[PDB]
């Protein structure tokens, strides 16, 4: 979806094979706050939320706790105590085609700053003046959504990027969402130092 309608899929009920996916040979950026990116297999969480959207490559640097700019203020604000990972890889092979791609939108105007993890999908006409817009478009009555000019032959700066933010949340739960446990073959008839399932 467009970044103003960032999509939350509650990934769970499954074996959390992070350090499996790690080496996908495609990820440009992989920043993990608070947890080791190569030991995330051993550090597992209760629920993982995958918030997906598409932004342009210049804007990725704003996607970090406590950052400021345009994306982090009017589209999607990361929590300041965020504990999770951020994943983003170039996707210009897909989300742009000759003639441009205008199916991606992002909010441009807002009265008040988004509180962290808030979703807003209103289509109201922004009012920057001092008079009621009375549902009338014009001067001092602006539409708040601006498209993206995605073209496959730009530079990387405007070149579209796909982003997935895994938000590792932990409560007083049995925490089934965990990485694979390795096993070693059975050796009999020798004084060995075992550790069976428990």
């Amino acid at each position, epitope marked *: 979806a467009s970044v103003y309608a960032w999509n939350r899929k509650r990934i769970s009920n499954c074996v959390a094979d992070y350090s499996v996916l790690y080496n996908s040979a495609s990820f440009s950026t992989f920043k993990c706050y608070g947890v080791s990116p190569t030991k995330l297999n051993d550090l597992c969480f209760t629920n993982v939320y995958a918030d997906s959207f598409v932004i342009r490559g210049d804007e990725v640097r704003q996607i970090a706790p406590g950052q400021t700019g345009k994306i982090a203020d009017y589209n999607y604000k990361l929590p300041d105590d965020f504990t999770g990972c951020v994943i983003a890889w170039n996707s210009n092979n897909l989300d742009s085609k000759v003639g441009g791609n205008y199916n991606y939108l992002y909010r441009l105007f807002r009265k008040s700053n988004l509180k962290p993890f808030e979703r807003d999908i209103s289509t109201e006409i922004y009012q920057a*003046g001092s008079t009621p817009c009375n549902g009338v478009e*014009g001067f001092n009555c602006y539409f708040p959504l*601006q498209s993206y000019g995605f073209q496959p032959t730009n530079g990387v700066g405007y070149q579209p990027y796909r982003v997935v933010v895994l938000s590792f949340e932990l409560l007083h739960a049995p925490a089934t969402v965990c990485g694979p446990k390795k096993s070693t073959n059975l050796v009999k008839n020798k004084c060995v130092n075992f550790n069976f399932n428990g």
Partner: antibody, heavy 123, light 109 residues
Framework: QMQLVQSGPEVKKPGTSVKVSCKAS????????VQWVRQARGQRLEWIGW????????NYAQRFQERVTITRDMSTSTAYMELSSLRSEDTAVYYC????????????????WGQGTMVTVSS | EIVLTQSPGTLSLSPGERATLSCRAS???????LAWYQQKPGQAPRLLIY???SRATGIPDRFSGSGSGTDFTLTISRLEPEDFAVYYC?????????FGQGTKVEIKR
């Protein structure tokens, strides 16, 4: 201080093209809008068009519907007006105006006016 | 798309008497969207009244606009001997924004 700094005078030729710029300083230029007006030496004022600084949406008068392009630079807070296929019968003074708009809410009138640039065109 | 006639063409008040310039529209307009400017010879016009009723910053108390639905008038309470110049109406309907014919007030004596 609320003000616009505008370009300098020029001498241009028939069939040429010109581009005029006026910088904004002293206010939150990121949310205001700019319109361009031109006036001969002592005649009724003439409206060209206007552009929203943020979105970049524009609007042009029917006389100049085709042969004008208005651009802006968010980085340096500067707006450009470009005239195409200019003629000797457009010699006038060009003003750019924008309201005082500062980060909270802003006025329903174009308070700030530049000093105007005179564009002279003669053979 | 919107026509703004401006009459009377010129006016001659000795400084201080009470004056009115008038402009008119032939279509629909939102009454806060007509503004007045004055232009001294050689200078860019300055904003005087926006919203047809609200004075901008620094303008003297001596002026106040009227602003009916489509019938607009700027009351002058007095000429302070600076105020002899031209004046213009300008509209913000969704149509292209135009300007008036411009009215000039001359000094006598």
């Amino acid at each position: 201080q609320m003000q616009l700094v505008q370009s300098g005078p020029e001498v241009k030729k028939p069939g040429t093209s010109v581009k005029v710029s006026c910088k904004a300083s002293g206010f939150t230029f990121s949310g205001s809008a700019v319109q361009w007006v031109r006036q001969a030496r002592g005649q009724r004022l003439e409206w060209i068009g206007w552009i929203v600084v943020g979105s970049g949406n524009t609007n042009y008068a029917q006389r100049f519907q085709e042969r004008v392009t208005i651009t802006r630079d968010m980085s340096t807070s500067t707006a450009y007006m470009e005239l195409s296929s200019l003629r000797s019968e457009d010699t006038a003074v060009y003003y750019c105006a924008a309201p005082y708009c500062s980060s909270t809410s802003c006025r329903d009138g174009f308070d700030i006016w530049g000093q105007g640039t005179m564009v002279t065109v003669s053979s | 798309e919107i026509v703004l006639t401006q009459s009377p063409g010129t006016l001659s008040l000795s400084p201080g008497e009470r004056a009115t310039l008038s402009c008119r529209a032939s279509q629909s307009v939102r009454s806060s969207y007509l503004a007045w400017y004055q232009q001294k010879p050689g200078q860019a016009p300055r904003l005087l009244i926006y919203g047809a009723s609200s004075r901008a910053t620094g303008i003297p108390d001596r002026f106040s606009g009227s602003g009916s639905g489509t019938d607009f008038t700027l009351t002058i309470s007095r000429l302070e001997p600076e105020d002899f110049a031209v004046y213009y109406c300008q509209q913000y309907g969704r149509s292209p924004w135009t300007f008036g014919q411009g009215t000039k007030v001359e000094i006598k004596r």
